[PDB]
Structures are given as structure tokens and as C-alpha cells.
């Protein structure tokens, strides 16, 4: 019954509580006398022995740079827990389902992500949570399953979607003002320039707000607008990492318009960033009814940040090899169908196929596809390997002559007339339904030959059976 507390600074703290020397020993009975533990702004790196304090109702930890927090997983009699630090990532917290008398949970000012929720949504008696100041917390819907949750703080947190909230069984307070959507867990899109609009007569660039796909949606489906201010604090818009001056911006409910944009400027556009405020103010949206009974539901004035990568290329995708046979003929049009040649726009594809592919010399030929949809076509060309295969050709003798009542098998006959194809393709025959060999005369057996790719032109052999003396 004397307790292992490996951290000198941690034990030092605890001895100060018991009025003993900083380096004194501590007793399973001494641990059990403890009503609270408050570690703040001291470098404590391991919490072992805590697993020991079975009687604390208050654990309060701020900025201690602990490696993890595992050892708290079963303090059944703990009522109020608080752990804050810029380094407290979500992994450092164990699952908290043991904490069966916990009413209060504050993990504010930390570096948690969404994986924290599935550790804390199994808490039976938690009335309130503060996940305030966690920028990487982006969706709070998993907390709908907690039975007693009444109050939730997510101030300054990057949540964007409130659809589901009425699922909360007992919630009457959501504090959710000033989210910074895309602040920690970045939002990026890779996009075709076709999705934008360049007008050369006005020299204007238009960017449709329909691209801002992670924008705030209130619980009832309401989608607030971006502010229309072109002040740097309100809108921060970037082209190729260069901030565009307010004087050039015009903002509507549909999108944003830049003036003074040249054709060269537009073509050179590789990146945009849209960082702006959302127009959602005091008393400007619906509140669900749960929160109207003397609670509060503020989801106001969020901030949105959205990175863009712009692609002006038009690219062509098609099957990249094909096989025809030796001397049949194909028209470029039939060629393109076969390989399914397509521009990414739905414009034209040309080719040199008629130039490169030689149908009379079996082999493999490089066709290069090209396409010019644009005012111009920096449409990089994609190559296709067209393959010609040898025509499957039977060769044989054309006459053979046998005595009556000679016995002959089919395979003997094909051997006798040196019947053969150019590729290992099997010859079929009407031989044994055409020749008699009991009755003299002239019999015409036709040879044939087929494979996966072609049928040969049939060949005739004249089998003469002569009544010889
Ligand atoms: Mg801004
Ligand atoms: Mg109102
Ligand atoms: Na708090």
C-alpha cells in the first residue's frame, strides 16, 4: 500500500496537498483522502498513480505537456473534469465511458479533432461540454446520442452544418459563434477553368459561390450569404497567392467578380483562395424550439476559408491500343469509335492514324491523337498503339487421289495434303461426311479455320478416289 508516482513534479504537487516533504512517500489511503487535483503550468509528463485517487470529484489540468491522459479512464466518482493545452491532441485522451458520475467536461483551448467525440459520447451523466477553441472540431453531430447533455460550447471551432441538432435529446444551449470553417482542417478543391467565367470585353473574372461547398447551413436548411464587403477583414481573395485589391472586387449573392483581368491573367490562373465572413447576425436566423425555453442558440458570424487549384487543360481519354487484321480497311471515324475518343469538354479529336498505320504490313503502329477545342489547343496529344495481325490463311494441296477402300482418318488426310495455317489455328473439315472411299469418284472437301479474332477464307481440296485394278 505505498503508491508509485514516477513524476517528481507530479508527486511534489501531491505532497504539498498532504503537507509532507516534496519527496515523501504516498499511501493508497493517502490518495483516497484527496478531494481534488489541480495541475496548472507545471511540466508534468506522466500521470501515473492518479489511477489511484478514487475520491476526487474535481480534476483540473492546464498546460502540463503530458504525453497522454490514459490513467483517468476509470475514476467513477469524478464529477467535474477540465483538461486544456495547445498540445492536447485527441489521441492523448482515452475513452471516457467509465466516468459515470461526471456532470461537467471542459476540453477547451486544445488541438482536438473529430475523433474526440466518439470518446465522450458514451458519458452517462454529463450535463455540459466545453469544446470551445478547438479549431479542428468540424462536426458535432455524433454527440446526439448522449442522454443528459444540456449545454454545448463550440466557440471558435470550424463547424459548418447544423442539420441534425433537433436530434439532441436535452440540449437547450448551443454556443457556436465565430466558427472558422476551413481554419484547421483545410478545404481544397481542384477545378476545371470551365467552372469559372472570363469575359474579355469587360476583362472580368467571375467566380460562382456554388463552389463553396462547405459553407454554413443552418438546421432548417437556410443557407446564409457571404458578406458583400470588400474590406480585407471581410473578404480576403487571392489569385496565385496575390491578394486582389478590394477596388477590383464585386460581390453578389451568386458569386464574386474581379475587374481588370486580362486573357493572359486568366490563362495563368493556377490558384485561388476565398476567405470571407458569412452574413449571419444577431437575430437573423431561426432557432430550434428546444432553445427557446430560456436557453440560447447562437451560431452567428462565421468565417469561411477555401483553397482552389485551377486547371485550364482539356484532356483526352481513350483506349490506348487496338488490333485489326491484315488487309481489311478502317476509316478514321470507325477507329475513334472503337477506342472511344473523347475530349474532357466534349469537343473534337483528330489523329494521324491514316498516316502511320500500315494495314498491309502486320505489326504495331503509333497513332498520335490531337484536339483543338480552344481559341487554341494546348491539348497535349495522347498516343495509341494500333496492332495489325496476320490474316489467318489455310494452305494445302488442291488434289489428292486414293484407291477405293483405303482407310484414312481425317487427321491423316490433313497430313497428306500438307494442310496448315500460318498461326496455330485448327483446321476443320467435312472430309468424313463428304468422301466415301468405298465408291470411286470426285469429292470436294472444303477446309475451314477459326479463332478469337478472325475466320479464314475456306479452301477447297479435290479428293479423287479411283477404282484401281
Ligand atoms: Mg477574411
Ligand atoms: Mg428571432
Ligand atoms: Na469553460
From TrEMBL:
Keyword set includes Secreted: yes
Keywords in alphabetical order: Cell wall, Membrane, Peptidoglycan-anchor, Secreted, Signal, Transmembrane, Transmembrane helix
Compartment annotation: Secreted, Cell wall
Broad class of the protein's primary localization: secreted
Source superkingdom: Bacteria
Membrane topology of the entry: Peptidoglycan-anchor
The protein, known as: Lmo1290 protein
Full protein: residues contained: 41 to 509 of 598
